[PDB]
């Protein structure tokens, strides 16, 4: 995707990815910590080990609005400088990240907390659900 | 540079970087989470003035061994599948990562804990000495007679 600036909140069938975000985002002089979480579809033995991919769907408008709300809360609550919350829609192969959260802050203490908060809240409140694709 | 495999523990003047590591590393089928921490030199005016860079020095062998010990501990204590612990030596300009820790595991819970553990334990136990390299004009921040 070609954009003027990488969106902080993204929900779509395309993807920017950790490499591009980390490469393009300029860390502010007052920030000394970045904590990135990548959620990846698994094909663990406990699920049969026959999963080839996951298909993600959502209520697009509702989801992105709630995602932005969580981002706002994360920044205000932990005092970090920036937070990215991205999630893919459509087909996602096992091993490919489908969920991304990047927190940028002054120190690691609050940056780790910020990332974990955004990740946990997103899972509890954002309307995005998966479907397994077998074989 | 030094692939084949990227060394899980690395200490030197060169740098693999998060982009290359995330790009090359293949996530195992039983892993659903990756937690990456990047430590970056920051300008700390509360330390006397504006900083240009952070310098890191050490006796590599000793530092590397403790880093490897911490890595093994992280994997064992948290049950994660893989852990990378990298750190740069020499001068690192503000904004450029100098410390990297990547934990790969089954779920969020243990992966986050593992990364935090490796990071905290490294800062407490690994003998890498740091020095803030201030920009010219430091004497202007605190003025007496
Ligand atoms: Cl909607
Ligand atoms: Na990614
Ligand atoms: Na890096």
Look up residue B48 and give its DSSP letter: T
Task: Indicate which ligand has the atom closest to the C-alpha of B38.
Answer: 3
Chain B: give the shortest CA distance to residue A59, in Å: 24
Q: Which CATH number fits domain B1-145: 3.30.365.10, 3.50.50.60, 3.40.50.150, 3.90.1170.40?
A: 3.90.1170.40
What residues of chain B lie within 8 A of the CB of A97, using their CB? 34
Interface probe for B, chosen from A16, A42, A111 (most Cβ of B below 10 Å), is A42
Chain mean position to CA A2 = 19
Look up residue B35 and give its DSSP letter: E
Asked how this structure was determined, the answer is: X-ray
Helix (H, G, I), strand (E, B) or coil at B63: helix
CATH superfamily for domain A1-135: Molybdopterin biosynthesis MoaE subunit (3.90.1170.40)
What residues of chain A lie within 8 A of the CB of B27, using their CB? 40, 95
Give one DSSP letter per residue of chain A, joined into a string. ---SS--SEEEESS---HHHHHHHPPPPTT--EEEEEEE-----GGGTS-EEEEEEEE-HHHHHHHHHHHHHHHHHHH--SEEEEEEE-EEEETTS--EEEEEEESSHHHHHHHHHHHHHHHHHHS-EEEEEEE-
Answer whether B86's CB lies under 8 Å from B115's CB: no
The resolution in Å comes to 2.0
CB contact under 8 A, B38 and A40: no
What residues of chain B lie within 8 A of the CB of A19, using their CB? 18-19, 22-23
């Amino acid at each position: 995707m070609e954009v003027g600036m990488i969106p902080r909140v993204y929900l779509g069938h395309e993807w920017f990815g950790a490499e591009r975000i980390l490469s393009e985002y300029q860390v502010p002089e007052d920030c000394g910590a970045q904590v990135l979480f990548l959620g990846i579809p698994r094909n663990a033995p406990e699920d049969g080990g026959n999963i080839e991919a996951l298909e993600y769907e959502a209520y697009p408008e509702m989801a992105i609005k709630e995602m932005e709300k969580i981002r706002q809360e994360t920044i205000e609550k932990f005092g970090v400088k920036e937070v990215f919350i991205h999630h893919r829609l459509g087909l996602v192969k096992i091993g490919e990240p489908s969920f991304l959260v990047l927190a940028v802050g002054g120190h690691r203490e609050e940056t780790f907390k910020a990332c974990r908060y955004a990740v946990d809240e997103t899972k509890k409140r954002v309307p995005i659900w998966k479907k397994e694709i077998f074989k």
